[PDB]
Amino acid sequence: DKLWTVKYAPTNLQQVCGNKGSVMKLKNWLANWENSKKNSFKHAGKDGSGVFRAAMLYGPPGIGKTTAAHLVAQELGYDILEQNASDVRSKTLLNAGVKNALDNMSVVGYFKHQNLNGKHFVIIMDEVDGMSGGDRGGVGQLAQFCRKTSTPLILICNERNLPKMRPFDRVCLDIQFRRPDANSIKSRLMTIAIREKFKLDPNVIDRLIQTTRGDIRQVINLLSTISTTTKTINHENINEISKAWEKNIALKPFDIAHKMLDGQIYSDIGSRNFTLNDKIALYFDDFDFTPLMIQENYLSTRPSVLKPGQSHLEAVAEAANCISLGDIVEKKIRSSEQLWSLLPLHAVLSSVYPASKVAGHMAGRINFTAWLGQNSKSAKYYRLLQEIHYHTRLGXXXXXXXXXXXXXXXXXXXXXXXXXXXXXXXXXXXXXXXXXXXXXX
Amino acid sequence: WVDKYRPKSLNALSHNEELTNFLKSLSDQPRDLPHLLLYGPNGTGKKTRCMALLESIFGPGVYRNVVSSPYHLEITPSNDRIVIQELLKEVAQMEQRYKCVIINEANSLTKDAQAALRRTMEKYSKNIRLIMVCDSMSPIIAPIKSQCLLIRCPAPSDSEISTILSDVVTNERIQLETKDILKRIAQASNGNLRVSLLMLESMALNNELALKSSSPIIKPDWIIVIHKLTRKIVKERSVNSLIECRAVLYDLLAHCIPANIILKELTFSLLDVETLNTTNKSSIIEYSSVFDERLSLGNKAIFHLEGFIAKVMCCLD
Amino acid sequence: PWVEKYRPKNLDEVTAQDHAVTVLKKTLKSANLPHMLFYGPPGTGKTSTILALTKELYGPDLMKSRILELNASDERGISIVREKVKNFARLTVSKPSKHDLENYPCPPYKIIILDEADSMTADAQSALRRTMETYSGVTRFCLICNYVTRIIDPLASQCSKFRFKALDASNAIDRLRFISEQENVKCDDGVLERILDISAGDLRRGITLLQSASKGAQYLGDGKNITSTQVEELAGVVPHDILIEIVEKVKSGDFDEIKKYVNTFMKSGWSAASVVNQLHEYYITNDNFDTNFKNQISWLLFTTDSRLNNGTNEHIQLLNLLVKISQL
Amino acid sequence: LMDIDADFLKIEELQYDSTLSLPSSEFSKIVRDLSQLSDSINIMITKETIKFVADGDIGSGSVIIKPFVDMEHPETSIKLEMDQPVDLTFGAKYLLDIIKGSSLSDRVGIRLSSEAPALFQFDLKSGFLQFFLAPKFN
Amino acid sequence: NLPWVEKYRPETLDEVYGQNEVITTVRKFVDEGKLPHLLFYGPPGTGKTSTIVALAREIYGKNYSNMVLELNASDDRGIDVVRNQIKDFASTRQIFSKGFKLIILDEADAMTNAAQNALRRVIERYTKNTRFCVLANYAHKLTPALLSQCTRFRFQPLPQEAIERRIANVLVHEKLKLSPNAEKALIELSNGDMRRVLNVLQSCKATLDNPDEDEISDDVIYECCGAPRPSDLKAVLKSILEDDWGTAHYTLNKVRSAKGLALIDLIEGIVKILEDYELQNEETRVHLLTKLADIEYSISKGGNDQIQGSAVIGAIKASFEN
Amino acid sequence: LQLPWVEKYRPQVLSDIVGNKETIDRLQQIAKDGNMPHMIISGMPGIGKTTSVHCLAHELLGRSYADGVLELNASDDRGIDVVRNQIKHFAQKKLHLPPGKHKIVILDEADSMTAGAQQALRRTMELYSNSTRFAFACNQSNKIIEPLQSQCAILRYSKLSDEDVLKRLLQIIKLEDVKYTNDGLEAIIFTAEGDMRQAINNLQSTVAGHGLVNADNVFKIVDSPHPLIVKKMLLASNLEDSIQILRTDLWKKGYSSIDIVTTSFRVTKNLAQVKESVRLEMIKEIGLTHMRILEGVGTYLQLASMLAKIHKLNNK
């Protein structure tokens, strides 16, 4: 009846697939909070989680952040007072609302009372990187609370390295959540399936995760599509329903790359059963991923379409070039909300053409696009190198920094005696080091 | 390190006297300094020949998201024209005696942006003086060229770069076995003082401050990887190989390394390969000449670098 | 700066481009003055022609009273064009003074001049359209730019086109000699013209050399003229000899040698892509190269040039160009 | 109507350390006055005496009222059944919100206890509107 | 005192030249009570705005302003204006006469996709009571969902016929004479844009006029709208084809600088003058059109006037080795 | 009154949609059960998305559609405020429905919804998914912030095959007694490229002005270069011949330079006569020129170079 992500939502931190390291880091902080307070938050314990009034969770969509924060709170007996983007968190309302609970106790904490925190709040300011123009000065006031609160404060966001999030930098314990581990999600998904009365090839359960880029919430929803679609599952159906489901609802981006890369469609015969018009049309079946898909695996095929006496390499270079050209086209299509009339050309230059040059037998296997997550790595690191520059600009363009900050690595990693010497003799602090350490790594 | 021995004054300028004097003879009217446009390779000493000229004119204490100082501010376009026309004009309120503004990477400015800065120059030129640092005065509209000193900044000679080298050791107490170790460095960075120096510190901390004839030149995290890729490209020229080169590129990019930079080094670390005849090479540059444009006209960089390698593996195999 | 200190104060002052001005003069006596689009290379006299036409038509009195100007500096968004611009446009003309009615022709209309209209968001240009069409009865626009391509077809249609041709070395010397005289500048022979060639068309730059250079010839105080080679060194042009190295290094020479040499040029040499421009003028003029050579070299400079106008890597592009011309 | 998943609480009649009562219009004025001085209002019931204090940055605010009973107008009388002293501090914002019940009953009952939420009550001819306010930290 | 461009603006439908197929269908539609949503698309100065304005008058007469709602790129038309003002007018009956309302969205292609999308949803919900007319230079800049909502009427470039006719009208109510092949030149250079014709024609009624009865020649026109002339252009070709480089490089360099011409113009004219020759090999044609087309393209982005010129000489020359 | 046929013959039940069979059935099943997940239906213009969702809405709620469905499209206010109130209030609304049914919120043209608003929607559909389910309809799912994306199923829609377009085309023909020709229908199909709305609209405009739906009539309302001519220009054995077709039949007749290219591409695509490899190299050319036309240089010259390059390939 209820969505699956709901009915199968963790009930104990003992069910959060992944980030277990960060969950611990979280739970701890929420434990030593009373003491951290007792000590005026000036004793950064062996964890550092001691000089921070509030914690800042962050990471990709559907990986357990909101589940952890809530759960870690309910586990230490505290009562929860949460807000999110659906609420108005402007500086005005913020100061006329929650500001008042920063040093207050739960009225529910009484009619519930052995609980040691039952009468205390854990403020969960969720979806903070979602505070728009409907929250004037919200981040500022919120970042000010991280310094003057008298109760645990937990903030969640997806992009910690954003400009809007700058005011939060030095003010709180930011624990990172990365994309859960496949085995974790694979194991979890299995458990689900079993309880849902069905089985699935570990190769299917595997590529899903790969498509979902780790979004455990998405896979769960995506996995509830089978039983919800068909009326009655049977002994045999299980093995075949995967097809219609996988090649349609689930891994559709794959059945596209498959068809597109099948040489049988480019041979004189099939060449007219599945016309040029159809090949181009396959593109409009997911014009979002199709270009990414072809580029991803146009070089992992055993071509059957090569002209007589044409090497696999040569034909690839031709598609390589076309892939390149199609890009030029895309950029322009995305430079003017009014250029969609160029998509057909892009269909040809980014998929159909490159494909026809190497279509045939599938040597390896259709892989999801590497470009997306690969675009996260590069981006998430430019932000780092950036803040590092806006700290060394005192001592070359941000570019000349990553192409000259090589020597620095030595006199900052070399042996790790002369510790303090170089470190401080650089005008760097704690975060100035922890940050420069990440990228350099 | 390198930041240490940097000329914090014009009297310290030890490079290109023709200009070092040009700057002195130019600072003879601290109340009348025409706009300035310095162009040239990187690490030639221009950006420093700037903040050193501002203490010569303004107060030496002229050292302190923008880099502001009690005498000047630095603008780095890292839209953008909005900032130019807005910030600047606001700084034009510096009268109620002008103020200097340095435009780093005047190449990173869009045609639609420059046009704004131009008019802005001709406007409050009384309260504002511009110092534009850049390389290759190609993407700079003429309206600007004829409103600022067209000053070039040729890099130091191999023999002149070494001179500034043996000096650093004399202070850091380094042991130079001979001049060789130095002169090799100058030819290694080909003129990039930012390198030759940041280099002489690298192969100096690895040789225990005792420079010996065995000089393991500086080899940054990336530059090396490019060469290992330059190799794989000449050895194994197959589709399966290309797939590998991919992951390498994908990682050079994910580690904040400019794609147009990868192309550059790679395009030349291939031409230095003796195992290639006039043909292969003259076809390699052309392919880079072409794929260079491709990069500046699109967004997904790999798509362009990969296609470059493919055309190469064919030019060879 | 003589550049602005010598800005034509009257429509007559602007010589260079007259094919358009002569027409402006005669239309000056009519309220039928069409909207206009001035366009041409840099510093050809466009912005001058406007202010002049205006002074010549309104006189300093109604000057700032019934004329609005917005340039690359001023903010010109969809919001501004539909507001400030549309407002002053729709607004009723101002009442002339008794004196104005006596010295200047006070047309029953105001003027909106959008200089550097070249860099206006197409959106804003569009918002300009109906505005500068329904208010022709009292308002008239002037759009200036360097490329017609940058101005939306609709507007190019509404405006009467005025193509400001470059400044021919013949049209320039006249206005140049008049500058050297009024400034007692000890100019040599191969100077007056060398200035125009180096700054072909852009008179502003042609004058900026005649000023930033003569002030340097006085420094020497030698009273000695200010020859050719004297100039260019300031303009940014590359030496003639350092060029001959190129030509010869290409007339014969393997790959590596050029790549080797080119590296040298980049290393420090005048980071001027203009090397291309000069390699052009050379080969096309030289009488020792066959037509078949002229032809192919022509196409190559064009290719590399086009490649260079895309923010490409200076070095790469230039290397290839030399390596290709050599194969020829 | 709305679909509300109410976290039903178990309110139980407790024995508060002190139990006063006074005109709602008065409690209102007092609360409104003091709230201009601090974000917190301290209510002290010591030696059969009602004392409200507000300590801010601009200054402090102190109000004290002694029990009595005017037979002329029973509704303007201040009661007070103390059994043990009480010193609690409440958020000014919540008192400013509770005083809004000052249109239902001309009198307001207040029951305080060191270990429980304060209880402000307004009497209705056939019921009541009561507020349970949790205190601040000590 | 309106500049001719505006002065001779069709006051009624019968005054619009060269768009008859549109005028007739539209008028029939109104008389038959089956007027669909309209999309008038075409290049500049073809009669689009003139036409709906006139069509609107003719339909409502004076109740115009109170029965018609017009907005254009000069107006604010973001999503807010659409759900509000526009939507309001579309869902509210008329105050005066009974019938359907009319909303005119001029230069609709200037609207954003967001707004266009909202616009479309409004047009969908109130199609049974209100009529919309969208105008644009490019249908392709219009959301398919919007376009798919109306009947299209392409306003094509004014044909010789039409333009020759209007020229006749202006010559009467204006003491003006135009030589035979001078009217022809004006035509060939206006590319069917009635707007450019009326413009140059007054750039002469204030140029040559001395005896108030002069004769406008081919020259007066070619020079007015700074455009080449067969003789000049057709000469520059010869110098390029026959004479040496140095010589041709001169001919071109002079003809354009002495007449204020630009490669762009010359190229075009040449391509056509050259399109009639009977070349030897077909490749001559190909490579020729190719390079010339490449040149023209690089110019639109500003390369190097000098080189690009030598490029034209080279291309034309090189290709003529057959 | 002038009831548009795109509206008059709009599928009123999941059955009537000639959509993407596979996916539609998926919906048919959700219609019978009731565990409708939040979903984002994306795809090209006019293939039956908005129809689809509304049809799913009914078969699920029957007489409840009235109070259990809240539609909000581009013509409505959908900012932070409405999302934080109207929408939220709706999900919090009490409505007694059968075991597996939930209230539906339909946000059409969802790619127009500002991020800030989408951002403020997140929590609402997460907290009240037990009584309220969301359906997003758009052309670009790319414009939907990921947090919302991970909360729902993504259903891609494909353009309609010519067969499918043809069927619903005939179904309307019978109910309207329209006089048609086979070539006439092929003209509509050919010019709708998988867009049912576009097809129908044209069909009606075609009958509304010529009664009989024949190729000649169809291409009259379309008013674009007639396919036949464009074809005879791309196949001309001599470059001189085709340039004449471009000069006499296309340019001289006043067709847009954009009009020419687009049709050229469309025709090259269906040129079965030629070979895949060939049609594609041509397309690559027509497109290159096309993009040139879009960058301003839409000159006759350009079109000529296009045909020239074509011949170079169709000769090699």
Ligand SMILES: Nc1ncnc2c1ncn2[C@@H]1O[C@H](COP(=O)(O)OP(=O)(O)OP(O)(O)=S)[C@@H](O)[C@H]1O
């Ligand atoms: N790490 C995890 N382990 C187990 N189940 C998970 C995990 N992450 C997500 N889920 C499922 O996904 C649903 C939502 O996860 P949340 O923790 O609320 O996501 P989130 O990381 O806050 O995502 P946002 O709001 O888009 S940032 C839960 O109700 C779970 O069923």
Ligand SMILES: Nc1ncnc2c1ncn2[C@@H]1O[C@H](COP(=O)(O)OP(=O)(O)OP(O)(O)=S)[C@@H](O)[C@H]1O
């Ligand atoms: N035709 C001319 N006659 C006389 N002086 C001229 C002429 N053209 C330019 N000048 C000089 O060049 C300077 C610039 O002229 P402007 O009118 O500002 O040029 P422009 O054509 O508007 O240039 P842009 O903005 O770069 S396009 C003036 O101050 C003049 O002294």
Ligand SMILES: Nc1ncnc2c1ncn2[C@@H]1O[C@H](COP(=O)(O)OP(=O)(O)OP(O)(O)=S)[C@@H](O)[C@H]1O
């Ligand atoms: N078909 C025509 N018949 C007569 N005069 C015309 C015609 N087309 C244009 N004109 C003249 O050109 C001027 C502009 O025509 P408009 O109808 O405003 O053109 P348009 O098609 O709306 O142009 P845009 O906005 O640039 S697309 C008018 O004032 C007329 O004098």
Ligand SMILES: Nc1ncnc2c1ncn2[C@@H]1O[C@H](COP(=O)(O)OP(=O)(O)OP(O)(O)=S)[C@@H](O)[C@H]1O
């Ligand atoms: N698959 C289909 N079967 C039958 N009729 C259809 C189909 N697709 C579209 N139609 C007709 O086209 C009209 C509009 O289709 P819609 O469902 O609104 O398309 P759409 O995909 O939502 O388009 P947008 O909003 O522009 S993306 C309907 O009212 C139908 O009459």
Ligand SMILES: Nc1ncnc2c1ncn2[C@@H]1O[C@H](COP(=O)(O)OP(=O)(O)O)[C@@H](O)[C@H]1O
């Ligand atoms: N004249 C000089 N004498 C000594 N060191 C110099 C000189 N010029 C440059 N350097 C070195 O180069 C570094 C920075 O180069 P920079 O001035 O920014 O040049 P560019 O702008 O070409 O990159 C300095 O910190 C310094 O170590």
Ligand SMILES: [Mg+2]
């Ligand atoms: Mg969450």
Ligand SMILES: [Mg+2]
């Ligand atoms: Mg100007």
Ligand SMILES: [Mg+2]
């Ligand atoms: Mg119009």
Ligand SMILES: [Mg+2]
């Ligand atoms: Mg829809």
